[PDB]
Design a protein around this ligand. Sequence first.
Ligand SMILES: *[C@H](C)[C@H]1/C(=C/c2[nH]c(/C=C3N=C(/C=C4\NC(=O)C(CC)=C4C)C(C)=C\3CCC(=O)O)c(CCC(=O)O)c2C)NC(=O)[C@@H]1C
Ligand SMILES: *[C@H](C)[C@H]1/C(=C/c2[nH]c(/C=C3N=C(/C=C4\NC(=O)C(CC)=C4C)C(C)=C\3CCC(=O)O)c(CCC(=O)O)c2C)NC(=O)[C@@H]1C
Ligand SMILES: CCC1=C(C)/C(=C/C2=NC(=C\c3[nH]c(/C=C4\NC(=O)[C@H](C)[C@H]4CC)c(C)c3CCC(=O)O)/C(CCC(=O)O)=C2C)NC1=O
Lengths: 183, 183, 183
Amino acid sequence: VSLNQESVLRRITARIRQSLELEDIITATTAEVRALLGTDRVMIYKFHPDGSGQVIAESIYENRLPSLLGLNFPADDIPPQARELLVKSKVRSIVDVATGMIGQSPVDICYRPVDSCHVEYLTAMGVKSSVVAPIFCQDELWGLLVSHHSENRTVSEDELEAMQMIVDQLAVAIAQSHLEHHH
Amino acid sequence: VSLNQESVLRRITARIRQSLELEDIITATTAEVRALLGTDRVMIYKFHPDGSGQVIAESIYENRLPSLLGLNFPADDIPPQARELLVKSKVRSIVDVATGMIGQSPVDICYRPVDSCHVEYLTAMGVKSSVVAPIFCQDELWGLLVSHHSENRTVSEDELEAMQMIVDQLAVAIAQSHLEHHH
Amino acid sequence: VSLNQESVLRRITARIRQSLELEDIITATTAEVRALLGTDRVMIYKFHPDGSGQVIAESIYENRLPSLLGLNFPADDIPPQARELLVKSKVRSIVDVATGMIGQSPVDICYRPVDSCHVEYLTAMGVKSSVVAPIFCQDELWGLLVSHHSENRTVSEDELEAMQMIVDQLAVAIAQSHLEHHH
Ligand SMILES: *[C@H](C)[C@H]1/C(=C/c2[nH]c(/C=C3N=C(/C=C4\NC(=O)C(CC)=C4C)C(C)=C\3CCC(=O)O)c(CCC(=O)O)c2C)NC(=O)[C@@H]1C
Ligand SMILES: *[C@H](C)[C@H]1/C(=C/c2[nH]c(/C=C3N=C(/C=C4\NC(=O)C(CC)=C4C)C(C)=C\3CCC(=O)O)c(CCC(=O)O)c2C)NC(=O)[C@@H]1C
Ligand SMILES: CCC1=C(C)/C(=C/C2=NC(=C\c3[nH]c(/C=C4\NC(=O)[C@H](C)[C@H]4CC)c(C)c3CCC(=O)O)/C(CCC(=O)O)=C2C)NC1=O
């Protein structure tokens, strides 16, 4: 009755089989991910070659947060130091605005203070909880799966696993789409 | 001249050896644990079959916290995930109300943000520092050893060992009493 | 053209070669360390036999913090437990006043709640960030390299590393001087 990661995964696979445009698979998927995670705003963020990115998919619950769909963000938003952790360690990050702490899990979770710049960035958006897992296409960092919530909350390892399954599945989605649209 | 875990432990073994009533072994021990730890309120909490529990022993320092002796707390107070952590990992938890962080050590200490509900709960009791170690009888989770303090204070890994030795020694006390008092 | 730790290290070694008095090697060096770390106040603190210490070197940026040069601090300022971590574990500590957490790295970083007494001490000085690495002469704990900042700042593993190289290099300076001033 309540969705689980296995079924969300089954549907992404089904959409691959239909040879939907990658942008369509991602849009459809995002809605389900939000329902599964239960957070207020789930987004999928795709990187541009120069390091900047764009929100290409987004599912918000009852307008509890503003919509950033279609918007572009500069590369300075993610420092070299931060990006390196995404590329090399494939790190999942959890920011907790209330405590000013960030916990990172590479692929236990150790929490350390988060840079005040980043927390202000999140606060400006009206976010109190942020979870980010990187999406890849082979060895290429392709984007981010972003989960935002307007209120403070604890994040279990269960939730990190669910997110990892989804970004792992999207990698298959992306890689397959490239192969089918090979000239 | 002063108290160490070793002298406190010997007295428990002596009380086991002399077969004092278990409820007495527990009461006496609780008082010494408070003196050993130096905290304001140390309690021993025994679980009921349905998951709820009762404070069956308590030693407070200079009336600095209210007495909760004899009181029952519902099972909802300790969520499934929390209880699972107690049963499988035999986890020690340290709550720091000031920083909103909780540190857990399975059987180093990793700190993460603690659920706001639990912090509100402790604040309701007037507690700024809480240390909890689980008590077992054989494989069965029997109760908890609880240390509360009205003011903020840091809890060292040394102190967790002391608590761990005591709950290990109390397990022998409880186990032995069942054996001696078999009809 | 720009400053990094190797160039700073190289400069300490150069002063040794010129056989400068140790006090000169230390005074000169601190200014370069501050320039390297970019912090408001970098100090070198030397222990007295009785546990007390003295600020023997100091480099401040644009009078953003008061001068502590020449002042003495009692041994109670560094408790037995804290000093023990310095002696056996040779711990580098980072205190983040905003979150009230302290992160310690022995020779990864784990953050724990810092004692309220110490936070009050740093707040009284107007310090929001403090990074401390111990200096040794053979087995003897000789002093501390201290970095203070008037604002929230994050310390990376890399920066602890630069600092470790520096105290390791100063240790050679000190050890050499003892050898030369042996009767
Ligand atoms: C400070 C002046 C600037 C800055 C620094 C900064 N950013 C990060 C870390 C991250 N920033 C992002 C950016 C985003 N988060 C999102 O949810 C989105 C999409 C809406 C973006 C573009 C991300 C993903 C990170 C990584 C952290 C994480 O995964 O949550 C840091 C590192 C913080 C730390 O302490 O680790 C820093 C220092 N960000 C700015 O906007 C500034 C210009
Ligand atoms: C309360 C009884 C007193 C007290 C306790 C206390 N201090 C520390 C930690 C440290 N205190 C120092 C001392 C200094 N740090 C400095 O930057 C300076 C100025 C040169 C001094 C004199 C140090 C080095 C530490 C170690 C922590 C670190 O390296 O950053 C603690 C331990 C804190 C903890 O939780 O680990 C305690 C309990 N300090 C006082 O001043 C009180 C008299
Ligand atoms: C009097 C003795 C005593 C009790 C009974 C107690 C309850 C208690 N609540 C706990 C956790 C918890 N309790 C709750 C939730 C709740 N708790 C509530 O009372 C709410 C009804 C509810 C929020 C709606 C949660 C979420 C946790 C886990 C906190 C975390 O792990 O972040 C824990 C485990 C955390 C720890 O080990 O410190 C205990 C022992 N603590 C005590 O010292």
